[PDB]
Ligand binder design. Structure first.
Ligand SMILES: [Mg+2]
Ligand SMILES: [Mg+2]
Ligand SMILES: [Mg+2]
Ligand SMILES: [Mg+2]
Ligand SMILES: [Mg+2]
Ligand SMILES: [Mg+2]
Ligand SMILES: [Mg+2]
Ligand SMILES: [Mg+2]
Ligand SMILES: [Mg+2]
Ligand SMILES: [Mg+2]
Ligand SMILES: [Mg+2]
Ligand SMILES: [Mg+2]
Ligand SMILES: [Mg+2]
Ligand SMILES: [Mg+2]
Ligand SMILES: [Mg+2]
Ligand SMILES: [Mg+2]
Ligand SMILES: [Mg+2]
Ligand SMILES: [Mg+2]
Ligand SMILES: [Mg+2]
Ligand SMILES: [Mg+2]
Ligand SMILES: [Mg+2]
Ligand SMILES: [Mg+2]
Ligand SMILES: [Mg+2]
Ligand SMILES: [Mg+2]
Ligand SMILES: [Mg+2]
Ligand SMILES: [Mg+2]
Ligand SMILES: [Mg+2]
Ligand SMILES: [Mg+2]
Ligand SMILES: [Mg+2]
Ligand SMILES: [Mg+2]
Ligand SMILES: [Mg+2]
Ligand SMILES: [Mg+2]
Ligand SMILES: [Mg+2]
Ligand SMILES: [Mg+2]
Ligand SMILES: [Mg+2]
Ligand SMILES: [Mg+2]
Ligand SMILES: [Mg+2]
Ligand SMILES: [Mg+2]
Ligand SMILES: [Mg+2]
Ligand SMILES: [Mg+2]
Ligand SMILES: [Mg+2]
Ligand SMILES: [Mg+2]
Ligand SMILES: [Mg+2]
Ligand SMILES: [Mg+2]
Ligand SMILES: [Mg+2]
Ligand SMILES: [Mg+2]
Ligand SMILES: [Mg+2]
Ligand SMILES: [Mg+2]
Ligand SMILES: [Mg+2]
Ligand SMILES: [Mg+2]
Ligand SMILES: [Mg+2]
Ligand SMILES: [Mg+2]
Ligand SMILES: [Mg+2]
Ligand SMILES: [Mg+2]
Ligand SMILES: [Mg+2]
Ligand SMILES: [Mg+2]
Ligand SMILES: [Mg+2]
Ligand SMILES: [Mg+2]
Ligand SMILES: [Mg+2]
Ligand SMILES: [Mg+2]
Ligand SMILES: [Mg+2]
Ligand SMILES: [Mg+2]
Ligand SMILES: [Mg+2]
Ligand SMILES: [Mg+2]
Ligand SMILES: [Mg+2]
Ligand SMILES: [Mg+2]
Ligand SMILES: [Mg+2]
Ligand SMILES: [Mg+2]
Ligand SMILES: [Mg+2]
Ligand SMILES: [Mg+2]
Ligand SMILES: [Mg+2]
Ligand SMILES: [Mg+2]
Ligand SMILES: [Mg+2]
Ligand SMILES: [Mg+2]
Ligand SMILES: [Mg+2]
Ligand SMILES: [Mg+2]
Ligand SMILES: [Mg+2]
Ligand SMILES: [Mg+2]
Ligand SMILES: [Mg+2]
Ligand SMILES: [Mg+2]
Ligand SMILES: [Mg+2]
Ligand SMILES: [Mg+2]
Ligand SMILES: [Mg+2]
Ligand SMILES: [Mg+2]
Ligand SMILES: [Mg+2]
Ligand SMILES: [Mg+2]
Ligand SMILES: [Mg+2]
Ligand SMILES: [Mg+2]
Ligand SMILES: [Mg+2]
Ligand SMILES: [Mg+2]
Ligand SMILES: [Mg+2]
Ligand SMILES: [Mg+2]
Ligand SMILES: [Mg+2]
Ligand SMILES: [Mg+2]
Ligand SMILES: [Mg+2]
Ligand SMILES: [Mg+2]
Ligand SMILES: [Mg+2]
Ligand SMILES: [Mg+2]
Ligand SMILES: [Mg+2]
Ligand SMILES: [Mg+2]
Ligand SMILES: [Mg+2]
Ligand SMILES: [Mg+2]
Ligand SMILES: [Mg+2]
Ligand SMILES: [Mg+2]
Ligand SMILES: [Mg+2]
Ligand SMILES: [Mg+2]
Ligand SMILES: [Mg+2]
Ligand SMILES: [Mg+2]
Ligand SMILES: [Mg+2]
Ligand SMILES: [Mg+2]
Ligand SMILES: [Mg+2]
Ligand SMILES: [Mg+2]
Ligand SMILES: [Mg+2]
Ligand SMILES: [Mg+2]
Ligand SMILES: [Mg+2]
Ligand SMILES: [Mg+2]
Ligand SMILES: [Mg+2]
Ligand SMILES: [Mg+2]
Ligand SMILES: [Mg+2]
Ligand SMILES: [Mg+2]
Ligand SMILES: [Mg+2]
Ligand SMILES: [Mg+2]
Ligand SMILES: [Mg+2]
Ligand SMILES: [Mg+2]
Ligand SMILES: [Mg+2]
Ligand SMILES: [Mg+2]
Ligand SMILES: [Mg+2]
Ligand SMILES: [Mg+2]
Ligand SMILES: [Mg+2]
Ligand SMILES: [Mg+2]
Ligand SMILES: [Mg+2]
Ligand SMILES: [Mg+2]
Ligand SMILES: [Mg+2]
Ligand SMILES: [Mg+2]
Ligand SMILES: [Mg+2]
Ligand SMILES: [Mg+2]
Ligand SMILES: [Mg+2]
Ligand SMILES: [Mg+2]
Ligand SMILES: [Mg+2]
Ligand SMILES: [Mg+2]
Ligand SMILES: [Mg+2]
Ligand SMILES: [Mg+2]
Ligand SMILES: [Mg+2]
Ligand SMILES: [Mg+2]
Ligand SMILES: [Mg+2]
Ligand SMILES: [Mg+2]
Ligand SMILES: [Mg+2]
Ligand SMILES: [Mg+2]
Ligand SMILES: [Mg+2]
Ligand SMILES: [Mg+2]
Ligand SMILES: [Mg+2]
Ligand SMILES: [Mg+2]
Ligand SMILES: [Mg+2]
Ligand SMILES: [Mg+2]
Ligand SMILES: [Mg+2]
Ligand SMILES: [Mg+2]
Ligand SMILES: [Mg+2]
Ligand SMILES: [Mg+2]
Ligand SMILES: [Mg+2]
Ligand SMILES: [Mg+2]
Ligand SMILES: [Mg+2]
Ligand SMILES: [Mg+2]
Ligand SMILES: [Mg+2]
Ligand SMILES: [Mg+2]
Ligand SMILES: [Mg+2]
Ligand SMILES: [Mg+2]
Ligand SMILES: [Mg+2]
Ligand SMILES: [Mg+2]
Ligand SMILES: [Mg+2]
Ligand SMILES: [Mg+2]
Ligand SMILES: [Mg+2]
Ligand SMILES: [Mg+2]
Ligand SMILES: [Mg+2]
Ligand SMILES: [Mg+2]
Ligand SMILES: [Mg+2]
Ligand SMILES: [Mg+2]
Ligand SMILES: [Mg+2]
Ligand SMILES: [Mg+2]
Ligand SMILES: [Mg+2]
Ligand SMILES: [Mg+2]
Ligand SMILES: [Mg+2]
Ligand SMILES: [Mg+2]
Ligand SMILES: [Mg+2]
Ligand SMILES: [Mg+2]
Ligand SMILES: [Mg+2]
Ligand SMILES: [Mg+2]
Ligand SMILES: [Mg+2]
Ligand SMILES: [Mg+2]
Ligand SMILES: [Mg+2]
Ligand SMILES: [Mg+2]
Ligand SMILES: [Mg+2]
Ligand SMILES: [Mg+2]
Ligand SMILES: [Mg+2]
Ligand SMILES: [Mg+2]
Ligand SMILES: [Mg+2]
Ligand SMILES: [Mg+2]
Ligand SMILES: [Mg+2]
Ligand SMILES: [Mg+2]
Ligand SMILES: [Mg+2]
Ligand SMILES: [Mg+2]
Ligand SMILES: [Mg+2]
Ligand SMILES: [Mg+2]
Ligand SMILES: [Mg+2]
Ligand SMILES: [Mg+2]
Ligand SMILES: [Mg+2]
Ligand SMILES: [Mg+2]
Ligand SMILES: [Mg+2]
Ligand SMILES: [Mg+2]
Ligand SMILES: [Mg+2]
Ligand SMILES: [Mg+2]
Ligand SMILES: [Mg+2]
Ligand SMILES: [Mg+2]
Ligand SMILES: [Mg+2]
Ligand SMILES: [Mg+2]
Ligand SMILES: [Mg+2]
Ligand SMILES: [Mg+2]
Ligand SMILES: [Mg+2]
Ligand SMILES: [Mg+2]
Ligand SMILES: [Mg+2]
Ligand SMILES: [Mg+2]
Ligand SMILES: [Mg+2]
Ligand SMILES: [Mg+2]
Ligand SMILES: [Mg+2]
Ligand SMILES: [Mg+2]
Ligand SMILES: [Mg+2]
Ligand SMILES: [Mg+2]
Ligand SMILES: [Mg+2]
Ligand SMILES: [Mg+2]
Ligand SMILES: [Mg+2]
Ligand SMILES: [Mg+2]
Ligand SMILES: [Mg+2]
Ligand SMILES: [Mg+2]
Ligand SMILES: [Mg+2]
Ligand SMILES: [Mg+2]
Ligand SMILES: [Mg+2]
Ligand SMILES: [Mg+2]
Ligand SMILES: [Mg+2]
Ligand SMILES: [Mg+2]
Ligand SMILES: [Mg+2]
Ligand SMILES: [Mg+2]
Ligand SMILES: [Mg+2]
Ligand SMILES: [Mg+2]
Ligand SMILES: [Mg+2]
Ligand SMILES: [Mg+2]
Ligand SMILES: [Mg+2]
Ligand SMILES: [Mg+2]
Ligand SMILES: [Mg+2]
Ligand SMILES: [Mg+2]
Ligand SMILES: [Mg+2]
Ligand SMILES: [Mg+2]
Ligand SMILES: [Mg+2]
Ligand SMILES: [Mg+2]
Ligand SMILES: [Mg+2]
Ligand SMILES: [Mg+2]
Ligand SMILES: [Mg+2]
Ligand SMILES: [Mg+2]
Ligand SMILES: [Mg+2]
Ligand SMILES: [Mg+2]
Ligand SMILES: [Mg+2]
Ligand SMILES: [Mg+2]
Ligand SMILES: [Mg+2]
Ligand SMILES: [Mg+2]
Ligand SMILES: [Mg+2]
Ligand SMILES: [Mg+2]
Ligand SMILES: [Mg+2]
Lengths: 48, 275
RNA sequence: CCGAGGGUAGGGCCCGUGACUGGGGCGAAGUCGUAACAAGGUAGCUGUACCGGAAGGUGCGGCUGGAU
RNA sequence: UGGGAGAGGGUGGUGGAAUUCCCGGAGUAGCGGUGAAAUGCGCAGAUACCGGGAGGAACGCCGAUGGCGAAGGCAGCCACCUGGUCCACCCGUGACGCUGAGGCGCGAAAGCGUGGGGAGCAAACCGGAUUAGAUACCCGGGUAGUCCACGCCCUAAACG
RNA sequence: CGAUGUCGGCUCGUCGCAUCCUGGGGCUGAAGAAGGUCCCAAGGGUUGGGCUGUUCGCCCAUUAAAGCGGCACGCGAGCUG
RNA sequence: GAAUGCCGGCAUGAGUAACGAUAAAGAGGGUGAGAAUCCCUCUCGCCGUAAGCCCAAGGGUUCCUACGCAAUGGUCGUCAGCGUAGGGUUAGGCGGGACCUAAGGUGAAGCCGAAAGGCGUAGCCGAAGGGCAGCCGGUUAAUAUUCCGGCCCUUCCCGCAGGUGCGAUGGGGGGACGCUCUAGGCUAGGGGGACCGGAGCCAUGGACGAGCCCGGCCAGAAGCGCAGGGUGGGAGGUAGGCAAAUCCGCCUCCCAACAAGCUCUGCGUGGUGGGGAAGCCCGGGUGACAACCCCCCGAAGCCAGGGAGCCAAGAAAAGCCUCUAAGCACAACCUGCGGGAACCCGUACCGCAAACCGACACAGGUGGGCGGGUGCAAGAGCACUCAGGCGCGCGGGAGAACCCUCGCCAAGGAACUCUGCAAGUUGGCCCCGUAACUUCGGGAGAAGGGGUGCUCCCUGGGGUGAUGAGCCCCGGGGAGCCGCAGUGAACAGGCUCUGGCGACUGUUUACCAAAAACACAGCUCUCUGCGAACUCGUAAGAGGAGGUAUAGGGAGCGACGCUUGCCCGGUGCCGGAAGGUCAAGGGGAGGGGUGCAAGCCCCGAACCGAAGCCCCGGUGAACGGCGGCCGUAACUAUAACGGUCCUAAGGUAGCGAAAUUCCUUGUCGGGUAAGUUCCGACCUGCACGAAAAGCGUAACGACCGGAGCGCUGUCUCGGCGAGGGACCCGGUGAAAUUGAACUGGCCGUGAAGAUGCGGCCUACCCGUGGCAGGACGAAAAGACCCCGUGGAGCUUUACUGCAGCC
RNA sequence: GAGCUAGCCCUGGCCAGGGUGAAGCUGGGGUGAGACCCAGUGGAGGCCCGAACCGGUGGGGGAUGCAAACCCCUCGGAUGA
């Protein structure tokens, strides 16, 4: 049956992407946290 | 004269349609239409704020002239009478001798070919618009402004009309479609005659489908819900109201008056509606 | 081939009968009231409608085949 | 051909009196109702009186033992559309007539459907009386309906 | 109660005997035939169907008879539901 | 040493289950250390509205080649989507961008919010919508509308020539639109040809033939031809299209008008460039100087912005054209021609799947296009089959029980069971024929029945031609032939009578309920006069609605028919300028603290002072409610009638043992041999009843009852057969569970059901296939039940607040 | 977090084939004119049968699954809410 993950590159970048995160106070707190933790990727990889 | 159907389906048995006899032109003036942006009953937050709306036929908005005092003295020929999906009245295409074209709501008895005009000096004839103070006491009227130059607000629905009952200084007394008696400023414009398509109210939708075509989604009873949802929700099996009949939001819905008490227009309303 | 008739199926008419039910006629030695005949104690009768334990009442309109 | 009378019919308009209600004024202790009462209304200002307004229905006098229509039935006044009918002339047609099973149309009131309208009145209904009782008569309320449009219903002491 | 799945049916039995039938007896208000009542006896047998979830029960047609109980009201790591 | 402890390791179950669709395999040859599994050939099977082909997502080198086989691959592996390495993706014209706008998002101005931030006309961003110039063929191991070849085209720049009042982000036109049905002419695609081209074949009894088999086209500028789309022309007036306007709009006049003309598209032809089969020869050569023609069928595609009908009335903006404004009129623009210029990103490969989503090379899920042929009435259905692709990554035997899926069955025919559950029956088309009832549509495919293949003869209309032959389509009438059987296979309703509920088509608990539940047209109450009421938001702002009482919100009821009674004392709501009560505030009689004092400070009565409540009234399709006792009639029985207690008032019409009835399987009637169910009745209705509607109702229902016919392995009552497993051999090899075990019966005992205690009985050691009675077997710290001053959802005239309103 | 699911908004796309045969229109009949009747034409509909497609009715299988909802048979809708 139809499962939950239905990959869509525009949807991914537009929802979790760097510019989405920077636009919002919560989103910037995510980036700060992920940079402080030392994450190698701040934002989901998506191919464009 | 509403049109009936033979019962060749369970729904055609009751369905009735308007006869569309007054309609002379089946395409709108391209320069007088603009897209009607459908809301689904959602506001700018994206929230439903009027339930059960959406999914109706696509519609173009016809720009309607609700001023008229806009072109005083300039006669216009009634070019056509057309269907407007956005209102119950029919609409009439005016060709001003100006070359300007506009729509008005079609009055009862308006004939294509006839001439209409707006202004204090207009003849008292169906389709003409005048300030209320120059319209003879007793004549029935429509598309009435509520305040001068703010545009026609009153008696616009199919078949409706207001009647001039008398004059009192700067104001004139109207009987509104609702039977409410009200002072309206004399400089307010109105159009003589009643709104056309009076048979509108005799239409029988006939089937659920027809409501959907109109953008009305199914309405679900409070009694059909659960207590999280509604005052009437819950109960084992069917249940009576079990409290004063209430809205989804808890206010009472049988008789509870809701017009604001200290409203400034109360000074202008002579007698509340009938029936 | 046709064919008495037999068989399958489906209709039409008529008769008898049926738990129960509707009113009707007769009976009369009962109960309730007394609607009509007198102006019958609300003049009567009437088509219709609604109503009442009952006869009946009332509305609307009609007739005189109504006493004074 | 020339005239006449008429609430004959249909449609659109329009007038006045009265009832009710609403507004303003003025005023006070009752009003209403009946055989007599009571319910009811009224000091939260009724009734009676004056001015203003809204609205529906019916048309006083004329009016008659009257007129018109096939019957049902038709009554303020104006206009338009339209039927029947009588008279005089004795001009035209030349028996073209009478009736009429079926058919078709019309058909008071009540009633029905859809929509309007709703003042007064008033089935049902509620209350007061009356009465032995009173699901009545009388009284105070009161919804259909009574009115308009369209469609049905097709009855009658539809009687001379 | 860190679980012993609860009615009824089906399947499969097995046991008790306070015995429904068949076998053996005594008494009889046992003439015979047929019964009644008690005693011995558990080897075998103890039907099909209508109703109802039913167990039970009532009914139809038979029968030598159409027994009653126990086995976690036997049997859901066997089925049904 | 225990915490169903934590981490790790390793056991048991066990050589056990399983190895992932029952589309299927066999042999020969090759390679190699090794071969059922890799390559090649032949044979066999399976898909073929796909299990083939192309595109978009998504994936991201999985593509190609060489070399490999430890691991990955459910076995094997020499193979591979695996390891290593090298190679491979070529664009002005395809897609997206340097164009447009849609929802929406952002947001100059502007508005709002403690902060963060929320809005917001314009503008901007935003596509799979609009717009825009490339087709055919060849080539690589691997890309190709991209490279090449042929023939076409677009924009930009510059120049030349001719032409013109040129010029725009401004005005206007246009772009520009639905659903259903549909005409004409075409193309795609397909069938046939006794005609054209072709390697060859004559078998096994016959055929050297009008034989078999194969193929018989593709792209193409200008021109031309056919079919269509689009558009009237001239003048005069002009006050409107936020300036201007010669444009557009409006008015008038004059020619024109199912015409033409002008224009644009489609199809045909077209210089030219290509392609080109079977067969047997080793992807390539030959076939071949290939031929390339006629007829028929024919779209849902094209002409297209075509036509008609209908109501629910069907985007925008740019490109484009026209108009003018500043300007500028040596410019500028337009037309033609010529030369130059023409950027960025994508392009491999998988793509209904072993490369995407499902932890797996997972029987699941995934949008668009092509999807041949024959026959079956049609069709994308069904059967077979083309092209193309596959045999599903463990096999080999055996021929038990039992399981699955399947086939048949004597006699019976629902006796099965909760229930005909399941499975039979029926089954397409043509014809005949068809009841109650009905809202006149229907019910209806009612029911029921007849026909159905093939051969010959005669004949009727239509399409394409030409009016004819041919082809193709739709018929009719005779006479015959064969079989058990002619929709001969495959796909394809069992039916009837009668109740309950819901009017109906719809909707629902994704993953235990599809229903009688929700919705629904429709009915009624009620609110709302517009800056509406109501909803979301602190607000601004939005929805409502660019709507206006024939409208919008809320509530109940639920097509339709016939109806919807009585009670307004309580609660609700509505009305009531009286009166009672009533907070802050006003008021300040009187009293107090303090000071030598003027003074300062405090308390405080009458009185005035809202909504709310009280109080008066209205109101039921507002919340709701709708009795009891005694007595009475020519036999009994009953009680029309009378009396009395109580109430706000005492259940009307209709219905009733009911989706409601406890007693209950009520009683009676029907059906049955027999009927706790069913249907019809009765009425002492435990405990119906009128919009939480009452009683009915044609049609409808994968709803729930009852009956009958047909037919059956449901059953009496079981038998046999098939395949996939189970079993055996080779390969690979889990799991929950497990205190340890050397783990028998009975009668007892024992914390009350003992392999483990006592007594007795029985018992050589170890497995394999089977069965489930026990191990109070496994699983899940019982979900019932209680307990905890544990939690959470819900309610209200519980308490206390808060929003909101007054 | 609405790449699952629910609703709405914008823009596209899809629905083989067959059946029934509403209004309207034409002709005929009918009438004073009408209503209306008959025939042909027509092609309506939350119409009918049935694929794709959307579902998920009953049974069977599956139950350490092919699968944390699947498989077979059967069955609902299929121009419309
Ligand atoms: Mg998706
Ligand atoms: Mg992904
Ligand atoms: Mg994307
Ligand atoms: Mg995308
Ligand atoms: Mg997206
Ligand atoms: Mg982003
Ligand atoms: Mg990481
Ligand atoms: Mg790093
Ligand atoms: Mg992140
Ligand atoms: Mg009309
Ligand atoms: Mg009709
Ligand atoms: Mg109708
Ligand atoms: Mg019709
Ligand atoms: Mg119907
Ligand atoms: Mg119409
Ligand atoms: Mg009209
Ligand atoms: Mg249109
Ligand atoms: Mg526009
Ligand atoms: Mg708009
Ligand atoms: Mg809008
Ligand atoms: Mg927004
Ligand atoms: Mg938002
Ligand atoms: Mg709402
Ligand atoms: Mg809504
Ligand atoms: Mg309109
Ligand atoms: Mg209308
Ligand atoms: Mg209606
Ligand atoms: Mg609409
Ligand atoms: Mg609605
Ligand atoms: Mg509802
Ligand atoms: Mg519920
Ligand atoms: Mg919630
Ligand atoms: Mg609540
Ligand atoms: Mg409730
Ligand atoms: Mg309840
Ligand atoms: Mg409930
Ligand atoms: Mg209940
Ligand atoms: Mg409920
Ligand atoms: Mg309920
Ligand atoms: Mg319910
Ligand atoms: Mg209630
Ligand atoms: Mg309740
Ligand atoms: Mg209650
Ligand atoms: Mg409120
Ligand atoms: Mg105002
Ligand atoms: Mg015989
Ligand atoms: Mg009398
Ligand atoms: Mg008397
Ligand atoms: Mg009398
Ligand atoms: Mg009565
Ligand atoms: Mg009585
Ligand atoms: Mg009475
Ligand atoms: Mg009379
Ligand atoms: Mg008189
Ligand atoms: Mg007279
Ligand atoms: Mg003469
Ligand atoms: Mg009459
Ligand atoms: Mg009447
Ligand atoms: Mg009234
Ligand atoms: Mg009495
Ligand atoms: Mg009534
Ligand atoms: Mg009525
Ligand atoms: Mg326990
Ligand atoms: Mg345990
Ligand atoms: Mg356990
Ligand atoms: Mg004897
Ligand atoms: Mg003895
Ligand atoms: Mg024995
Ligand atoms: Mg024994
Ligand atoms: Mg029994
Ligand atoms: Mg019993
Ligand atoms: Mg009994
Ligand atoms: Mg015997
Ligand atoms: Mg026992
Ligand atoms: Mg017991
Ligand atoms: Mg017991
Ligand atoms: Mg037991
Ligand atoms: Mg037992
Ligand atoms: Mg048991
Ligand atoms: Mg079980
Ligand atoms: Mg059991
Ligand atoms: Mg067990
Ligand atoms: Mg067991
Ligand atoms: Mg067990
Ligand atoms: Mg069972
Ligand atoms: Mg159960
Ligand atoms: Mg310890
Ligand atoms: Mg453990
Ligand atoms: Mg453990
Ligand atoms: Mg542990
Ligand atoms: Mg651990
Ligand atoms: Mg070990
Ligand atoms: Mg084992
Ligand atoms: Mg091998
Ligand atoms: Mg090997
Ligand atoms: Mg090979
Ligand atoms: Mg095949
Ligand atoms: Mg095929
Ligand atoms: Mg991946
Ligand atoms: Mg490649
Ligand atoms: Mg590679
Ligand atoms: Mg390997
Ligand atoms: Mg290996
Ligand atoms: Mg190896
Ligand atoms: Mg491996
Ligand atoms: Mg694997
Ligand atoms: Mg090797
Ligand atoms: Mg591989
Ligand atoms: Mg290489
Ligand atoms: Mg190129
Ligand atoms: Mg550029
Ligand atoms: Mg853009
Ligand atoms: Mg685009
Ligand atoms: Mg392009
Ligand atoms: Mg080209
Ligand atoms: Mg390549
Ligand atoms: Mg448009
Ligand atoms: Mg469009
Ligand atoms: Mg449609
Ligand atoms: Mg055509
Ligand atoms: Mg072509
Ligand atoms: Mg063909
Ligand atoms: Mg030979
Ligand atoms: Mg042509
Ligand atoms: Mg001008
Ligand atoms: Mg070749
Ligand atoms: Mg050659
Ligand atoms: Mg040659
Ligand atoms: Mg089509
Ligand atoms: Mg409409
Ligand atoms: Mg726009
Ligand atoms: Mg200048
Ligand atoms: Mg030019
Ligand atoms: Mg660039
Ligand atoms: Mg490529
Ligand atoms: Mg698939
Ligand atoms: Mg996942
Ligand atoms: Mg595999
Ligand atoms: Mg797969
Ligand atoms: Mg093809
Ligand atoms: Mg077939
Ligand atoms: Mg077929
Ligand atoms: Mg099929
Ligand atoms: Mg083939
Ligand atoms: Mg295989
Ligand atoms: Mg074996
Ligand atoms: Mg199979
Ligand atoms: Mg048999
Ligand atoms: Mg039978
Ligand atoms: Mg039989
Ligand atoms: Mg049954
Ligand atoms: Mg079949
Ligand atoms: Mg019948
Ligand atoms: Mg009929
Ligand atoms: Mg029907
Ligand atoms: Mg048949
Ligand atoms: Mg039937
Ligand atoms: Mg044959
Ligand atoms: Mg056969
Ligand atoms: Mg098949
Ligand atoms: Mg069928
Ligand atoms: Mg059956
Ligand atoms: Mg029946
Ligand atoms: Mg019902
Ligand atoms: Mg239903
Ligand atoms: Mg339902
Ligand atoms: Mg109904
Ligand atoms: Mg309904
Ligand atoms: Mg329904
Ligand atoms: Mg449907
Ligand atoms: Mg659930
Ligand atoms: Mg469910
Ligand atoms: Mg769940
Ligand atoms: Mg669930
Ligand atoms: Mg289920
Ligand atoms: Mg369900
Ligand atoms: Mg269903
Ligand atoms: Mg529901
Ligand atoms: Mg419902
Ligand atoms: Mg109703
Ligand atoms: Mg709020
Ligand atoms: Mg706003
Ligand atoms: Mg708004
Ligand atoms: Mg708006
Ligand atoms: Mg509105
Ligand atoms: Mg409902
Ligand atoms: Mg009826
Ligand atoms: Mg009350
Ligand atoms: Mg009250
Ligand atoms: Mg009272
Ligand atoms: Mg209460
Ligand atoms: Mg009040
Ligand atoms: Mg006073
Ligand atoms: Mg003082
Ligand atoms: Mg002192
Ligand atoms: Mg007060
Ligand atoms: Mg009422
Ligand atoms: Mg009460
Ligand atoms: Mg109530
Ligand atoms: Mg007596
Ligand atoms: Mg009762
Ligand atoms: Mg009553
Ligand atoms: Mg009963
Ligand atoms: Mg009942
Ligand atoms: Mg009950
Ligand atoms: Mg009880
Ligand atoms: Mg009972
Ligand atoms: Mg019982
Ligand atoms: Mg019984
Ligand atoms: Mg039963
Ligand atoms: Mg039952
Ligand atoms: Mg009884
Ligand atoms: Mg309710
Ligand atoms: Mg109910
Ligand atoms: Mg009720
Ligand atoms: Mg009923
Ligand atoms: Mg249904
Ligand atoms: Mg159903
Ligand atoms: Mg069997
Ligand atoms: Mg066999
Ligand atoms: Mg076998
Ligand atoms: Mg086998
Ligand atoms: Mg076998
Ligand atoms: Mg062996
Ligand atoms: Mg040991
Ligand atoms: Mg023990
Ligand atoms: Mg023991
Ligand atoms: Mg032992
Ligand atoms: Mg020991
Ligand atoms: Mg011991
Ligand atoms: Mg021992
Ligand atoms: Mg022993
Ligand atoms: Mg066991
Ligand atoms: Mg044990
Ligand atoms: Mg056990
Ligand atoms: Mg056990
Ligand atoms: Mg468990
Ligand atoms: Mg638990
Ligand atoms: Mg725990
Ligand atoms: Mg526990
Ligand atoms: Mg517990
Ligand atoms: Mg639970
Ligand atoms: Mg307990
Ligand atoms: Mg406590
Ligand atoms: Mg405690
Ligand atoms: Mg709590
Ligand atoms: Mg669209
Ligand atoms: Mg679309
Ligand atoms: Mg379809
Ligand atoms: Mg036809
Ligand atoms: Mg037409
Ligand atoms: Mg349909
Ligand atoms: Mg259909
Ligand atoms: Mg259908
Ligand atoms: Mg299923
Ligand atoms: Mg089945
Ligand atoms: Mg089976
Ligand atoms: Mg499962
Ligand atoms: Mg399946
Ligand atoms: Mg299946
Ligand atoms: Mg089917
Ligand atoms: Mg269907
Ligand atoms: Mg279809
Ligand atoms: Mg449908
Ligand atoms: Mg639609």
């Amino acid at each position: 049956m139809k499962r939950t993950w239905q990959p869509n590159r525009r949807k991914r970048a537009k929802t979790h992407g760097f510019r989405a995160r920077m636009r919002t106070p919560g989103g910037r707190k995510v980036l700060k946290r992920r940079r402080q933790k030392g994450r190698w990727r701040l934002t989901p990889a998506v191919r464009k | 004269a509403v049109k009936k159907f033979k019962p060749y389906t369970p729904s055609r048995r009751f369905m009735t349609v308007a006869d569309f006899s007054e309609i002379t032109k089946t395409e709108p003036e391209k320069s007088l239409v603009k897209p009607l942006k459908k809301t689904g009953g959602r506001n700018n937050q994206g929230r439903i704020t009027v339930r059960f709306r959406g999914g109706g036929h696509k519609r173009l908005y016809r720009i309607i002239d609700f001023k008229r005092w806009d072109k005083v003295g300039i006669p216009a020929k009634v070019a056509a009478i057309e269907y407007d999906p956005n209102r119950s009245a029919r609409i009439a295409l005016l060709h001003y001798v100006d070359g300007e074209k506009r729509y008005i709501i079609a009055p009862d008895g308006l004939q294509v070919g006839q001439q209409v005009v707006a202004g204090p000096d207009a003849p008292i004839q169906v389709g003409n618009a005048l300030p209320l103070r120059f319209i003879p006491v007793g004549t029935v009227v429509h598309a009435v402004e509520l305040e001068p130059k703010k545009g026609a607000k009153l008696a616009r629905a199919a078949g409706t009309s207001a009647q001039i009952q008398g004059r009192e200084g700067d104001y004139v007394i109207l009987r509104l479609p609702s039977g409410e008696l009200r002072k309206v400023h004399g400089e307010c414009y109105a159009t003589v005659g009643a709104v056309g398509n009076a048979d509108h109210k005799n239409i029988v939708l006939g089937k659920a489908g027809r409501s959907r075509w109109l953008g009305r989604r199914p309405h679900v009873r409070g009694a059909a819900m659960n207590p999280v949802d509604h005052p009437h929700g819950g109960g084992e099996g069917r249940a009576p109201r079990g409290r004063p009949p209430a809205s989804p939001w808890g206010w009472q819905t049988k008789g509870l008056k809701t017009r604001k008490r200290r409203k400034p227009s109360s000074r202008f309303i002579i007698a509340r509606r009938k029936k």
